[PDB]
Amino acid sequence: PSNWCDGVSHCPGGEDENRCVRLYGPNFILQVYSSQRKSWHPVCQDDWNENYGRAACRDMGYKNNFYSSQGIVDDSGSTSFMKLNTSAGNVDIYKKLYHSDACSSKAVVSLRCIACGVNLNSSRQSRIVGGESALPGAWPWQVSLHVQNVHVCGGSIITPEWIVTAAHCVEKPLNNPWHWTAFAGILRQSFMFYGAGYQVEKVISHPNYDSKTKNNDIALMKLQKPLTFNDLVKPVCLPNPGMMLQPEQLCWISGWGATEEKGKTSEVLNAAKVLLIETQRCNSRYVYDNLITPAMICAGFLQGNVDSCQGDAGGPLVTSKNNIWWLIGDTSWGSGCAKAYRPGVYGNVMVFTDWIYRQMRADG
Amino acid sequence: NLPDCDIDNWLNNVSVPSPLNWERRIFSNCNFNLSTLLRLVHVDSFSCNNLDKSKIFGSCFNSITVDKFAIPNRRRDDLQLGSSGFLQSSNYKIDISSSSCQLYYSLPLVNVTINNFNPSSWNRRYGFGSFNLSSYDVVYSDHCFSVNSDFCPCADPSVVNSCAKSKPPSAICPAGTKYRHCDLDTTLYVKNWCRCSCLPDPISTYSPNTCPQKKVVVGIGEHCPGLGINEEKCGTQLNHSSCFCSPDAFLGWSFDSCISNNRCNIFSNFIFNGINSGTTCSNDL
Numbered sequence: 001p002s003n004w005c006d007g008v009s010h011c012p013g014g015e016d017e018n019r020c021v022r023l024y025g026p027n028f029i030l031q032v033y034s035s036q037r038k039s040w041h042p043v044c045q046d047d048w049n050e051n052y053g054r055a056a057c058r059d060m061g062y063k064n065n066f067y068s069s070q071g072i073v074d075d076s077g078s079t080s081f082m083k084l085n086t087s088a089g090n091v092d093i094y095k096k097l098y099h100s101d102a103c104s105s106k107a108v109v110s111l112r113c114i115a116c117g118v119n120l121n122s123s124r125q126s127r128i129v130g131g132e133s134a135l136p137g138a139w140p141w142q143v144s145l146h147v148q149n150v151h152v153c154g155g156s157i158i159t160p161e162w163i164v165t166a167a168h169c170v171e172k173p174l175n176n177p178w179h180w181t182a183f184a185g186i187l188r189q190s191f192m193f194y195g196a197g198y199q200v201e202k203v204i205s206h207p208n209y210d211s212k213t214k215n216n217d218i219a220l221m222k223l224q225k226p227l228t229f230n231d232l233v234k235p236v237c238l239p240n241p242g243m244m245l246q247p248e249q250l251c252w253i254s255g256w257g258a259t260e261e262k263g264k265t266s267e268v269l270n271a272a273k274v275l276l277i278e279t280q281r282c283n284s285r286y287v288y289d290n291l292i293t294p295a296m297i298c299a300g301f302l303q304g305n306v307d308s309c310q311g312d313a314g315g316p317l318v319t320s321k322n323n324i325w326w327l328i329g330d331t332s333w334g335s336g337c338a339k340a341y342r343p344g345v346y347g348n349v350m351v352f353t354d355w356i357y358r359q360m361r362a363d364g
Numbered sequence: 365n366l367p368d369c370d371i372d373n374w375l376n377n378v379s380v381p382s383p384l385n386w387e388r389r390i391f392s393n394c395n396f397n398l399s400t401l402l403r404l405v406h407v408d409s410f411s412c413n414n415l416d417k418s419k420i421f422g423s424c425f426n427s428i429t430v431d432k433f434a435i436p437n438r439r440r441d442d443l444q445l446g447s448s449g450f451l452q453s454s455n456y457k458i459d460i461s462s463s464s465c466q467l468y469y470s471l472p473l474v475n476v477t478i479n480n481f482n483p484s485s486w487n488r489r490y491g492f493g494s495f496n497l498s499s500y501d502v503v504y505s506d507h508c509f510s511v512n513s514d515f516c517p518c519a520d521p522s523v524v525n526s527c528a529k530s531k532p533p534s535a536i537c538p539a540g541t542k543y544r545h546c547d548l549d550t551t552l553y554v555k556n557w558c559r560c561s562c563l564p565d566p567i568s569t570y571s572p573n574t575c576p577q578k579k580v581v582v583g584i585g586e587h588c589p590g591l592g593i594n595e596e597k598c599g600t601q602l603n604h605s606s607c608f609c610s611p612d613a614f615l616g617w618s619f620d621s622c623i624s625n626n627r628c629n630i631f632s633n634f635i636f637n638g639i640n641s642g643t644t645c646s647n648d649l
């Protein structure tokens with residue numbers, strides 16, 4: 001896991017560095033790490049067929065899942081592109097790639113490994129503090145995780161088999177997967193009782209997670225049975241390095257959290273609009289006195305009244321961009337609920353996007 | 365036998381005010397002449413609203429509310445009628461619906477001295493004084509803040525004798541007032557962390573509701589109720605000490621000058637009253 005994509009070859013064959021793969025951009029432009037120049041470069045559309053897309057998603061912790069793949073005009077401004085060759089009789093794609101100045105088709109590949117980031121159209125949903133009721137189907141990635149059939153923390157899905165949430169919910173002695181039970185696609189907490197559970201087979205916690213400063217707070221529940229996708233349950237695409245996330249950008253938070261501090265959890269799933277808070281604004285002497293690590297995100301309003309609460313932990317921080325939803329944050333902790341000068345504090349998924357893939361491939 | 369108002373003597377006085385501290389002189393029961401006011405005063409421009417300029421000759425008034433204040437060079441254009449600039453929203457509002465004749469004029473820089481002030485009690489019982497500046501500046505508010513008749517900028521001796529981070533300054537407030545807000549909080553390992561009220565600065569307080577310092581706008585007749593005070597800058601740390609706020613905390617003010625072609629600019633909104641009626645008439649004929 002941690003030996004993957006570090007610049008040092010571990011296995012004698014060197015598959016750790018030759019098969020480093022990630023996506024890029026809101027339009028999902030594929031990149032392949034070049035060991036000779038220590039940089040990421042996109043791939044050409046030229047002489048590429050869909051069988052190589054099977055091998056790319058498989059090495060990207062997505063196994064056989066493959067939604068679609070088409071060629072798009074390059075936008076990252078890269079000077080070099082990987083070029084495939086069909087003269088080689090081998091079956092591995094990475095020995096087939098070599099550097100070239102430009103592609104003949106003037107296009108780079110848009111790779112989609114799973115149909116994510118799409119939901120049913122919903123008009124009015126601001127159900128976290130100070131708002132109105134919600135509608136089903138607008139947040140199909142959102143799931144709830146239960147210990148002894150009562151809610152503890154929320155969750156969001158990215159594949160049929162994996163659920164991401166916060167590590168403080170899975171802290172000791174709750175590090176045993178037998179206690180956890182996940183429910184998917186049910187809005188009412190009075191209905192997730194009879195046979196709707198999805199048991200977690202193994203809990204994954206961050207190795208450098210520290211509870212004193214509550215930094216590196218990420219956790220990955222994996223189910224035995226893959227989730228059967230329909231209109232009520234759909235995944236959300238993992239965000240890529242290289243999007244210019246603007247300040248103040250309109251994001252959405254969700255969860256079964258309380259409507260006020262120290263209050264009981266909500267009967268129905270709540271979801272309301274919040275805004276990003278810039279990290280250099282948040283880690284000043286004023287907002288939290290240098291408590292925000294680079295693996296942490298501040299979101300919401302400094303004026304308050306729209307913020308996460310207890311029970312909102314594990315929920316998704318999602319934004320809309322090119323009609324695709326992106327899970328940029330996970331609710332780690334919150335100093336109060338709906339209060340000014342103390343907004344919701346969220347864990348940065350973006351720092352840990354590569355760490356999720358390291359557990360996806362090794363436990364496939 | 366009825367005497368003259370000598371309005372020209374009042375504008376050409378050596379003391380020239382600022383838009384923050386504009387005055388008012390209710391001229392009544394005396395004579396004048398608009399020709400002598402136009403001649404003895406070096407007029408830049410002269411305009412009248414809701415009253416004909418040519419009809420001042422012979423027609424007269426019950427009482428004339430005469431206001432004056434100097435013009436900043438960068439704030440000459442904001443004195444447009446009905447504008448939403450800093451001068452018309454935080455220094456002096458001009459009633460457009462009343463009979464008003466505006467006068468623009470200048471006085472020579474040899475005989476002009478400026479007595480800047482800050483009309484208010486909320487911001488003058490709590491430390492203030494000479495507006496630190498040079499021999500020819502004109503203060504102008506850019507955002508007026510109003511507070512209650514109980515806000516003690518100074519915090520409470522006790523909460524702080526038990527705080528331990530963000531120790532915001534503090535002093536014993538005055539008999540009849542209420543301690544400022546402070547919600548002893550806890551974050552991870554930092555215990556008793558006090559985030560007392562109006563924290564950043566009155567103009568960056570993202571809590572326009574928790575900070576007792578609310579924002580407001582001036583009003584026909586009424587000057588600025590109060591300016592701005594960084595609430596983390598008011599008070600010594602010693603406890604047994606009165607609420608002496610300090611001179612370097614007054615934020616919300618700006619010092620633009622008054623010098624145009626080797627001469628200082630001044631304005632006026634002569635508010636009127638009583639057309640074809642009064643005993644303060646004129647000889648303009």
Ligand SMILES: CC(=O)N[C@@H]1[C@@H](O)[C@H](O)[C@@H](CO)O[C@H]1O
Nearest residue numbers: 085087088089090095096097098
């Ligand atoms: C297959 C073959 O005979 N030619 C290889 C070539 O593919 C390889 O790129 C090069 C150095 O990397 O070494 C040659 O011997």
Ligand SMILES: CC(=O)N[C@@H]1[C@@H](O)[C@H](O)[C@@H](CO)O[C@H]1O
Nearest residue numbers: 085088089090095096097098099
């Ligand atoms: C890109 C390039 O020119 N190098 C090829 C290499 O990709 C291939 O794996 C090897 C053996 O088949 O032959 C080399 O010539």
Ligand SMILES: CC(=O)N[C@@H]1[C@@H](O)[C@H](O)[C@@H](CO)O[C@H]1O
Nearest residue numbers: 368396397398399400401647648
């Ligand atoms: C005293 C005064 O200011 N009034 C003068 C008056 O003496 C003079 O006779 C008349 C004609 O020039 O003009 C008026 O303005």
Ligand SMILES: CC(=O)N[C@@H]1[C@@H](O)[C@H](O)[C@@H](CO)O[C@H]1O
Nearest residue numbers: 376377378471472473474475476
């Ligand atoms: C009349 C008046 O007020 N102006 C005086 C002037 O008489 C004096 O000779 C000179 C000295 O500065 O300038 C002004 O102070």
Ligand SMILES: CC(=O)N[C@@H]1[C@@H](O)[C@H](O)[C@@H](CO)O[C@H]1O
Nearest residue numbers: 493494495496497498611612619
């Ligand atoms: C004590 C006082 O208020 N006067 C100071 C003055 O000594 C200083 O030279 C000047 C420079 O801007 O600033 C003023 O505030």
Ligand SMILES: CC(=O)N[C@@H]1[C@@H](O)[C@H](O)[C@@H](CO)O[C@H]1O
Nearest residue numbers: 511512513514515542543545576
């Ligand atoms: C006038 C008065 O005595 N009432 C005060 C008010 O000024 C203050 O803004 C409010 C909030 O602290 O508390 C009230 O008791």
